Amino acid sequence: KKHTGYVGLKNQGATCYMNSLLQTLFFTNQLRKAVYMMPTEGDDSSKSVPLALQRVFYELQHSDKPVGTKKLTKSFGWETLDSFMQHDVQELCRVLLDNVENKMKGTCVEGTIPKLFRGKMVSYIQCKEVDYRSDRREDYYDIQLSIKGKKNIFESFVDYVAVEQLDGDNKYDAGEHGLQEAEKGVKFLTLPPVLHLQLMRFMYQTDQNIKINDRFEFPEQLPLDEFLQKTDPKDPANYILHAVLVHSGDNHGGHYVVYLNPKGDGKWCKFDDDVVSRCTKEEAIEHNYGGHCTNAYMLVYIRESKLSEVLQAVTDHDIPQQLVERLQEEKRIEAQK
Numbered sequence: 220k221k222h223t224g225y226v227g228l229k230n231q232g233a234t235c236y237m238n239s240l241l242q243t244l245f246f247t248n249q250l251r252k253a254v255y256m257m258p259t260e261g262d263d264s265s266k267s268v269p270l271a272l273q274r275v276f277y278e279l280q281h282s283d284k285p286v287g288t289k290k291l292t293k294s295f296g297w298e299t300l301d302s303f304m305q306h307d308v309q310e311l312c313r314v315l316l317d318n319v320e321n322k323m324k325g326t327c328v329e330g331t332i333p334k335l336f337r338g339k340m341v342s343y344i345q346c347k348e349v350d351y352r353s354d355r356r357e358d359y360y361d362i363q364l365s366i367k368g369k370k371n372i373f374e375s376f377v378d379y380v381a382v383e384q385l386d387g388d389n390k391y392d393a394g395e396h397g398l399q400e401a402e403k404g405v406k407f408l409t410l411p412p413v414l415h416l417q418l419m420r421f422m423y424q425t426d427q428n429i430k431i432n433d434r435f436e437f438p439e440q441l442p443l444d445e446f447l448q449k450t451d452p453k454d455p456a457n458y459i460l461h462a463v464l465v466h467s468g469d470n471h472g473g474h475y476v477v478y479l480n481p482k483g484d485g486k487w488c489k490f491d492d493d494v495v496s497r498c499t500k501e502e503a504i505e506h507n508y509g510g511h512c513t514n515a516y517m518l519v520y521i522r523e524s525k526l527s528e529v530l531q532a533v534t535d536h537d538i539p540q541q542l543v544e545r546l547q548e549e550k551r552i553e554a555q556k
Contacts, residue, residue, distance in 0.1 A: 220283050227493040229285045236308040239464045239477035242490045245279045246481040249529050253328035255538045268294045268318035277546050285493035308517050309361045309417050336360045339408035349396045361415040371436040376446050406448045410456045412525035416518040430470040434510025458520035467513040478503035483526045
């Protein structure tokens with residue numbers, strides 16, 4: 220806190236990726252401000268995920284001491300020894316962001332989650348020998364990128380938009396045209412201001428969940444224009460690395476950490492539960508490539524054109540005085556035992 224200006228989160232069990240994700244969301248300043256503005260005055264403290272996230276964020280903004288998350292884990296009901304071990308980071312991110320997206324309905328920050336995180340892609344099936352095509356628009360809040368046998372993020376995105384062949388016994392049911400040989404793939408229509416990329420190191424013969432510790436390179440600056448169906452000359456898809464969520468160890472267990480440059484200025488900090496320290500750019504990026512068991516499993520990028528708005532400064536006045544009073548009360552009631 221005193222070294223860095225940022226406070227850590229308590230170790231309170233095998234919550235795995237949770238503390239890492241919480242710092243990542245907290246330092247999505249535009250999301251943080253919108254989270255503070257949610258009308259939770261009449262919410263039950265034991266049950267409200269929205270209020271629970273306001274508390275963690277408030278504590279992360281104000282506290283000099285490591286911040287606790289028991290009321291938050293309670294609120295979305297992941298309380299068992301291995302509850303976080305049975306889920307992955309994108310599943311947790313969906314729970315938190317869905318709950319927060321609901322409460323923002325009928326408020327000045329409605330549709331903050333889609334605005335920040337939601338992109339558009341087209342899933343197509345095109346028949347080869349008959350004139351039939353099926354195009355369906357899909358929304359995504361995150362991308363699961365294949366890393367096995369891939370050297371870098373570029374090769375992952377190439378693999379993601381690669382054409383799959385439907386041949387032989389795997390022919391596509393084209394209705395009136397019967398079974399048909401077809402091509403199946405996805406194209407990107409839009410990339411969102413805040414890009415959540417999970418690296419599929421943790422995957423499912425042998426009936427075992429395994430961790431791939433192979434070298435996988437990701438850059439500081441990531442150009443994605445070449446993966447868009449139609450690019451905008453005014454707004455190119457140039458992305459800036461904001462967060463590197465790191466796991467040290469193997470499939471069964473290990474240590475979770477997040478590297479952030481919160482202001483998007485290339486000044487990196489390591490967030491290790493209660494311990495926040497300054498680190499080199501090299502430690503945050505290159506040292507988490509893995510290869511020949513400490514490596515990245517999730518990357519956050521922010522679109523260069525949206526960086527200053529996404530990372531817009533947060534002051535103490537951005538927290539509604541009502542909300543401040545309710546958490547001020549909670550801290551006083553607990554200080555009576």
